[PDB]
UniProtKB/Swiss-Prot annotation, chains A, B:
Location of the protein in the cell: Secreted
Subunit-level organization: Homodimer; disulfide-linked. Detected in extracellular fluid as mature homodimer, and in complex with its propeptide. Interacts with ACVRL1, BMPR2 and ACVR2B with high affinity (in vitro). Identified in a complex with ACVRL1 and ACVR2B. Has ten times lower affinity for ACVR2A (in vitro). Interacts with ENG, forming a heterotetramer with a 2:2 stoichiometry. Can form a heteromeric complex with ENG and ACVRL1. Interacts with type I receptor ACVR1.
Name of the protein described by the UniProt record: Growth/differentiation factor 2
Record: disease: Telangiectasia, hereditary hemorrhagic, 5: A multisystemic vascular dysplasia leading to dilation of permanent blood vessels and arteriovenous malformations of skin, mucosa, and viscera. The disease is characterized by recurrent epistaxis and gastro-intestinal hemorrhage. Visceral involvement includes arteriovenous malformations of the lung, liver, and brain.
Function: Potent circulating inhibitor of angiogenesis. Signals through the type I activin receptor ACVRL1 but not other Alks. Signaling through SMAD1 in endothelial cells requires TGF-beta coreceptor endoglin/ENG.
Tissue specificity remark: Detected in blood plasma (at protein level).
Chain spans, region Interaction with ENG: 79-93
Length: 106, 106
């Protein structure tokens, strides 16, 4: 059963070019939503009626319409130590939208 | 600029096998979110920080991590005339989550 779930994704801030303004941490766990949104669906997929309808339409017209996507439905914040406009290391205690909390078909 | 926007998708309830319980309408406009989530991004894409971070990581490791997805971020309801458990045509005035209102990279 390769369905929509949260899997591991470690993100190094230097690789994405954010080390120019983020001092710490060097890496953090962002996770990622991976998996198919096809039927039969599952309980924790938590689909919208539109993703269900869209998946059905994709099944009958695969070349015209795409299928639903496994995306983050809830995000959690992290804390980062960034450079202030005057070079002062300032802590952003709740940097929102950085880590995946829940996944779902949308 | 092939970016994340709302495009047309007409859904026939008979094709998706929902005509067994939905009397009317035969078809309705559900729309769909289509388009790339790559950079440079746009204003109405309205990305989360995780979709931005994920797209960056995808750019540097295309085979390990997938990119962000263009998905519905807000849904609108429709009205359907369905069969009651005793065969009575009943109107569901607000059948939620059926039509796309806004799109975005998630
Ligand atoms: Cl299965
Ligand atoms: Cl199902
Ligand atoms: Cl829904
Ligand atoms: Cl939902
Ligand atoms: Cl297919
Ligand atoms: Cl397509
Ligand atoms: Cl979100
Ligand atoms: Cl706290
Ligand atoms: Cl904060
Ligand atoms: Cl923030
Ligand atoms: Cl462009
Ligand atoms: Cl951008
Ligand atoms: Cl965000
Ligand atoms: Cl947002
Ligand atoms: Cl690519
Ligand atoms: Cl992949
Ligand atoms: Cl939604
Ligand atoms: Cl009304
Ligand atoms: Cl209602
Ligand atoms: Cl409803
Ligand atoms: Na087709
Ligand atoms: Na997907
Ligand atoms: Na999200
Ligand atoms: Na790679
Ligand atoms: Na997409
Ligand atoms: Na949605």
């Amino acid at each position: 059963g390769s369905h929509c779930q949260k899997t591991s994704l470690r993100v190094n801030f230097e690789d994405i070019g954010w080390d120019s303004w983020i001092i710490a941490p060097k890496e953090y766990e962002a996770y990622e939503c991976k998996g198919g949104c096809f039927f039969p669906l599952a309980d924790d997929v938590t689909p919208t009626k539109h993703a269900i309808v869209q998946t059905l339409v994709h099944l009958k017209f695969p070349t015209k319409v795409g299928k639903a996507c496994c995306v983050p439905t809830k995000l959690s914040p992290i804390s980062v130590l960034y450079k202030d406009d005057m070079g002062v290391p300032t802590l952003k205690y709740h940097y929102e939208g950085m880590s995946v909390a829940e996944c779902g078909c949308r």
